[PDB]
Amino acid sequence: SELDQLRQEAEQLKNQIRDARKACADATLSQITNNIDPVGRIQMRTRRTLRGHLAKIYAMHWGTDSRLLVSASQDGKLIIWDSYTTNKVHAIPLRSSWVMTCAYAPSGNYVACGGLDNICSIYNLKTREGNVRVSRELAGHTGYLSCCRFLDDNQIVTSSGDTTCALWDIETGQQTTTFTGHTGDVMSLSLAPDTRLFVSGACDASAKLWDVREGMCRQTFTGHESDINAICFFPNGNAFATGSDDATCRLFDLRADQELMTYSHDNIICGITSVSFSKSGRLLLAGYDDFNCNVWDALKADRAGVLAGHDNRVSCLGVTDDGMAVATGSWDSFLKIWN
Amino acid sequence: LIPIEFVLPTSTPETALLHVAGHGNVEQMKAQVWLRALETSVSADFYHRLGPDHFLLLYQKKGQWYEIYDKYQVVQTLDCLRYWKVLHRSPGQIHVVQRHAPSEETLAFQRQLNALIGYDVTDVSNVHDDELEFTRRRLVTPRMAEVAGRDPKLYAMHPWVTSKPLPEYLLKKITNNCVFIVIHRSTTSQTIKVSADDTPGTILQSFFTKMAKKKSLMDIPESQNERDFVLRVCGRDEYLVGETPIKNFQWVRQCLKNGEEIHLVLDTPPDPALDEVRKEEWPLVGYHEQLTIHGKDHESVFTVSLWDCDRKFRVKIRGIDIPVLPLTVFVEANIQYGQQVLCQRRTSPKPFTEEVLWNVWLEFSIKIKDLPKGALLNLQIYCGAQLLYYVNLLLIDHRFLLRHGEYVLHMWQLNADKLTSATNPDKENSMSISILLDNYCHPIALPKHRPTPDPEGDRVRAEMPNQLRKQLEAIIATDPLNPLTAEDKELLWHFRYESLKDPKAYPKLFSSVKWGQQEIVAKTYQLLAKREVWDQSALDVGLTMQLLDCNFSDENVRAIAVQKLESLEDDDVLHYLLQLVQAVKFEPYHDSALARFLLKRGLRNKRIGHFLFWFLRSEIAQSRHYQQRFAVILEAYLRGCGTAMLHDFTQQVQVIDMLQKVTIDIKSLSQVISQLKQKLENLQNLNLPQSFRVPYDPGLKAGALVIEKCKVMASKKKPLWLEFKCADPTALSNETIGIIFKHGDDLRQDMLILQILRIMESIWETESLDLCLLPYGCISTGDKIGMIEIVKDATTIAKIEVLSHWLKEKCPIEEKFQAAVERFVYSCAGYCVATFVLGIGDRHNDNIMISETGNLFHIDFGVPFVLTPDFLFVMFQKFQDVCVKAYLALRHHTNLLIILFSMMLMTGMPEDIEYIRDALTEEDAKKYFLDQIEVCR
Amino acid sequence: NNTASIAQARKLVEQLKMEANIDRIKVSKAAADLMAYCEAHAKEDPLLTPVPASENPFREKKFF
Numbered sequence A: 001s002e003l004d005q006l007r008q009e010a011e012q013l014k015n016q017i018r019d020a021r022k023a024c025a026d027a028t029l030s031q032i033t034n035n036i037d038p039v040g041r042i043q044m045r046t047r048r049t050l051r052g053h054l055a056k057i058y059a060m061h062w063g064t065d066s067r068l069l070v071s072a073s074q075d076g077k078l079i080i081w082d083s084y085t086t087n088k089v090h091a092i093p094l095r096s097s098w099v100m101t102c103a104y105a106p107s108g109n110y111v112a113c114g115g116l117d118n119i120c121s122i123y124n125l126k127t128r129e130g131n132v133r134v135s136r137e138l139a140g141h142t143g144y145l146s147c148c149r150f151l152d153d154n155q156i157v158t159s160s161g162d163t164t165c166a167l168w169d170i171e172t173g174q175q176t177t178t179f180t181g182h183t184g185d186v187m188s189l190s191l192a193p194d195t196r197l198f199v200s201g202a203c204d205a206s207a208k209l210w211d212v213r214e215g216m217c218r219q220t221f222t223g224h225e226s227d228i229n230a231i232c233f234f235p236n237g238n239a240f241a242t243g244s245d246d247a248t249c250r251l252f253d254l255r256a257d258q259e260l261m262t263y264s265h266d267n268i269i270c271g272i273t274s275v276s277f278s279k280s281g282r283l284l285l286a287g288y289d290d291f292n293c294n295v296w297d298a299l300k301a302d303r304a305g306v307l308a309g310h311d312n313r314v315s316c317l318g319v320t321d322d323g324m325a326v327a328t329g330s331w332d333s334f335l336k337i338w339n
Numbered sequence B: 001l002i003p004i005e006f007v008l009p010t011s012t013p014e015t016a017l018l019h020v021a022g023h024g025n026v027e028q029m030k031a032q033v034w035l036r037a038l039e040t041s042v043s044a045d046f047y048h049r050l051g052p053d054h055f056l057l058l059y060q061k062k063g064q065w066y067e068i069y070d071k072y073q074v075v076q077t078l079d080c081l082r083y084w085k086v087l088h089r090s091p092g093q094i095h096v097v098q099r100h101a102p103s104e105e106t107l108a109f110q111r112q113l114n115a116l117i118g119y120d121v122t123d124v125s126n127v128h129d130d131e132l133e134f135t136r137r138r139l140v141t142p143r144m145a146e147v148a149g150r151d152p153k154l155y156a157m158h159p160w161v162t163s164k165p166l167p168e169y170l171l172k173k174i175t176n177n178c179v180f181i182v183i184h185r186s187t188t189s190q191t192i193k194v195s196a197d198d199t200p201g202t203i204l205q206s207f208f209t210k211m212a213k214k215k216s217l218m219d220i221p222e223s224q225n226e227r228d229f230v231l232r233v234c235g236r237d238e239y240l241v242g243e244t245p246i247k248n249f250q251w252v253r254q255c256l257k258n259g260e261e262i263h264l265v266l267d268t269p270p271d272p273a274l275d276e277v278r279k280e281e282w283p284l285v286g287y288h289e290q291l292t293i294h295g296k297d298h299e300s301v302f303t304v305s306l307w308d309c310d311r312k313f314r315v316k317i318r319g320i321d322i323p324v325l326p327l328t329v330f331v332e333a334n335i336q337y338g339q340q341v342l343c344q345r346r347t348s349p350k351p352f353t354e355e356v357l358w359n360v361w362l363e364f365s366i367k368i369k370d371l372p373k374g375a376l377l378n379l380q381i382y383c384g385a386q387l388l389y390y391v392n393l394l395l396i397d398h399r400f401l402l403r404h405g406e407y408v409l410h411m412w413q414l415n416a417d418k419l420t421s422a423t424n425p426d427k428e429n430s431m432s433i434s435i436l437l438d439n440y441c442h443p444i445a446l447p448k449h450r451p452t453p454d455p456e457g458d459r460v461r462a463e464m465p466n467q468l469r470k471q472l473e474a475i476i477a478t479d480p481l482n483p484l485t486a487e488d489k490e491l492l493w494h495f496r497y498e499s500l501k502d503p504k505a506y507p508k509l510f511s512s513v514k515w516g517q518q519e520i521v522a523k524t525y526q527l528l529a530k531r532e533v534w535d536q537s538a539l540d541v542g543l544t545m546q547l548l549d550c551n552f553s554d555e556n557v558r559a560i561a562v563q564k565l566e567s568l569e570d571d572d573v574l575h576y577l578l579q580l581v582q583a584v585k586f587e588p589y590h591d592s593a594l595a596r597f598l599l600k601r602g603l604r605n606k607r608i609g610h611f612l613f614w615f616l617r618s619e620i621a622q623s624r625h626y627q628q629r630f631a632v633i634l635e636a637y638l639r640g641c642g643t644a645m646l647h648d649f650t651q652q653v654q655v656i657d658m659l660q661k662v663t664i665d666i667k668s669l670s671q672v673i674s675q676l677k678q679k680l681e682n683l684q685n686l687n688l689p690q691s692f693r694v695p696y697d698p699g700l701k702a703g704a705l706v707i708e709k710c711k712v713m714a715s716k717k718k719p720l721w722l723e724f725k726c727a728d729p730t731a732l733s734n735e736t737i738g739i740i741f742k743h744g745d746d747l748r749q750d751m752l753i754l755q756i757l758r759i760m761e762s763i764w765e766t767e768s769l770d771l772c773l774l775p776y777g778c779i780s781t782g783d784k785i786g787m788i789e790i791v792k793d794a795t796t797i798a799k800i801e802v803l804s805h806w807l808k809e810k811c812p813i814e815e816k817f818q819a820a821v822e823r824f825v826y827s828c829a830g831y832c833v834a835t836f837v838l839g840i841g842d843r844h845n846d847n848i849m850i851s852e853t854g855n856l857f858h859i860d861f862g863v864p865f866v867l868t869p870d871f872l873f874v875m876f877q878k879f880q881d882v883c884v885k886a887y888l889a890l891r892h893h894t895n896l897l898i899i900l901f902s903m904m905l906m907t908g909m910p911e912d913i914e915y916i917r918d919a920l921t922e923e924d925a926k927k928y929f930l931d932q933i934e935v936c937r
Numbered sequence C: 001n002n003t004a005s006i007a008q009a010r011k012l013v014e015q016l017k018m019e020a021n022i023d024r025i026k027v028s029k030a031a032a033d034l035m036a037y038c039e040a041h042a043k044e045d046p047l048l049t050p051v052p053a054s055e056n057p058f059r060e061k062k063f064f
């Protein structure tokens, strides 16, 4: 009675959402974008190689200076690199070897990391003694720390294996907000340029837009046939792309609350590990589990180029805030800069 | 306090009401009663003469006379009080009865048993604890229960039933679902044909009904009913009764496979009592909250939980002392857990005198609160580096308490040995070590973990990301000889419920857990409290073997492994008995669940009892390091079986010894033959009995020795080629039970290797092939002394293209001839494929023997293999097809082959484990295997 | 186990009500907006349009 009536109300509101989305689906991005000049072939060259990690690299994140970058690795170390000079600005050994994520703070003073340990260890690079000292152990998550991004020097969002995300205030060591609702492990997230919104991708083959201010899911996007491994915002902040283990990427617009474009090719069979937009967003750089990192024209949906510079899975990648270079860390223990 | 009514022995037996402190100690209570008695006694003289030791406190629990053995048990914990309170008994009654010294019957019985075992069970001259005697007292109850529930008739007859379904090549042998049975009665023969799927009882009822009227002609008394007969193989004592398909008996299937006829003879039901069991009179022998100081007043403190002590473990050495002078020396202690090194501590080099003193305290980084149940202080005396001695000591004793005081231990001198927990018996020329463990005003107990729900796994139930799942499963897919790197250990430990439902990972899961911590162990116990998938899993016997292996010492992991073994049927138990034995070596304690498993299987089968008896006797005589443990189990066993088994063991042991003496004496140097025959006639004069079930055959009795058929060979050891004669007049033929008795060559190898091959074929037969191998039974009896069976009509291949001429000639007909040709091929390829896996295929022809009937067997287990040209000439398509189907069939149980090859290579023989894999190597493996076959060609 | 199933289905339906109560925008305008965004920042996106080697810090110079 109460549960069957509430289940049929759920399953009516769902088709009301599908119809509210189909209504706006008047034309595709492929139709409107047929005319624009194709991007051509993005011939990219390996500018740098970052040696020093002994095993798989699990994460990396550029600093806002577009020159420094953190990197987490299976060998249990958290290294800070100077991309321009290749020198290791810091080689921090970690308490847990199973680090999975890292995030250079936009301020550059703090860096955060975490992993299977179920703790988000926040480190201060500018320490009282100039050492690499641990500022905080943000504990409370009941699962492995899967990803995190600094809002400021005192606030940081982290996702975990409890199927939830959470905003923390570094000083209080307390979960400011808790983002519940997902039905699967949350693999990734992405802060909007406006720190009030962020999206998150999960293994149930759906993504969800959260309001940092309040902590509610604003929209939920589907379409992937498998887990979402990576997610990021379109530079403007009104759209975002998702990579999935279904060997396809997809674009979703928040205002249209539906998929705009699909990026895939029959040759590609392995899942997507990472994605990033160019400063303008015209280029989508997708990392794959075939040692490749394909460059797509986001508007034409055409595979503009291919980056094949790694010997193992291209696990992670990022783009500088100035779009000057692309970093790609991989299981080969080496990151590679591209231009 | 509580009121208890104690019954004195003084006349009616005086009884008085007393009170005992609710939190007292057994002994005190004794004194309490002693004084009141001494004061109220009508004749206190009797109590004055004696003391409290002479009497024992017995209480009847529902008619069962229980004794309060341990003298330090908590008075409240006494089950008697709980039983009374549930019964509302007030005041409770306990009786006081003197210690009546033994009688003679019992001492003679004990002497008999000790003669059987080869070691005294009451020897206490090489012991530092009372562990052995308490094990002996404890084992009584399971044995009494196991004996209480069983059938006399079935056990005495011990049907060798089976429950596997027939292989292909044997189903055809049954035409129209029927088989031909020869029936003997007197010398009257009656051939009948009965369906292969009819149980023997129905067969006997039918045999009665068919010929009931002419029963006199068959020479059966007419007064007997159907109840008076059962079938019995002619020439054996292997009865055929019960409710089992007549196709499910290993002898029927052997007769079919080899192809002989089925001969059976009617027999009478052996009586139940003859297996009577010697009566026995040995009477019927917490949580962290209660065992911790915190939360309690110092006035009422009685014990300290081991987990409250944060002090780093510390041990004081005093010195070493060798009476005999054999440089720098130095002790090097190390805590170890199942070959895992927890912590170490060495000491400075010192001058090497016959006695060297240190009087130094070593401290271990591990904390007294972080000791697992069954760590093992290993103490070594290196030399300069070459190790010279070693010794080990349990840090928690057998009753959940820590070790405290001064201990002097004797040193074994240099495996399952280096993990030995016994003191050297040689107290005259052995290096001695003296150490001190600091005392404590109260016992250092160790509570029992309590099961608590673990939400870390309960609500963590959504499928993990496909990448992490891929990594997990890819890790689990390697062989157990793949060492788990720290990374993998951490990954698996976090994912400690993704693997809970995958049995094929359980000996990689528990190879990550870090026992040196308390939280880890508590969470492991929580994990193992939820084991639904494991419980109702597939009863594999390569997995439950890596659970009973060396690397593990827990009390619950082995518990679940044995709970899986609880289901096996008889034949399998018997298949892997040898290895179960080599496995009890690795135990941490004497009283375990593996030992009780072996004991409980031994008491409901006779073949199991026989094989267990001989294996344990061999190991006792051969392996002193654990001989006390083996002996305790073996004696706890021998008191359960029947009198007939005792008599049979006695006669068997008599014959083995007598021959021992004769043999060695001979090996001292027609002269030898004549002296041997004189000594054998003396043996007949020494009453060498003619009724002893041959050790490797519970049904095959030997008889009076045929003196002229014996001899001494010209080989190295020159064993005796005895030829006994059957001892049952209903033998279908007049063939001689042949044996060979060799001394000076290790006979542990041939035993294990034969179990290996015997399983290799049990796998092949599980795969509906038949390679026709000949596992002749061998059993070892002492150090470099072992009886071997004889393969009738055998010859040496080195002694003999001419091979096929020899064969042809031997075979008078081309039909039998080609039957032999199939045998020679099937069996020459089988043996090849099966020696190549083990890495011992390289052998000179001196160790290969061909049987006239077509079979080919190897001997003397001390190029891929031997595939000499003669083998090819005697043979080619079928050879290859069989070779491939074999190798492919074997590689489907590599986990088990490698487990065995290892669980043995350590306990037995003196990188070595790698070969098995280089050669184990689907299509690519076939190509390699055939490159190995065609290259030897 | 209805109070849990009901509290969950209620969270579900309040979420779907949240998501459905948004004024979506025609896809055509979403595209036009994104296209004109790239058109605007195509000059300011060196990954899209190759920049001079001198302006690239990685190639031209080793000192920074």
Ligand SMILES: Nc1ncnc2c1ncn2[C@@H]1O[C@H](COP(=O)(O)OP(=O)(O)O)[C@@H](O)[C@H]1O
Pocket (backbone or CB within 6 Å): B715, B716, B717, B718, B740, B742, B776, B788, B789, B790, B791, B792, B794, B795, B796, B846, B849, B859, B860
């Ligand atoms: N089951 C058996 N049946 C017949 N003969 C056997 C059996 N087992 C061993 N032999 C004989 O024993 C001899 C080998 O004895 P052994 O002492 O092992 O030789 P070596 O000392 O050269 O290794 C062979 O000649 C073989 O005929």
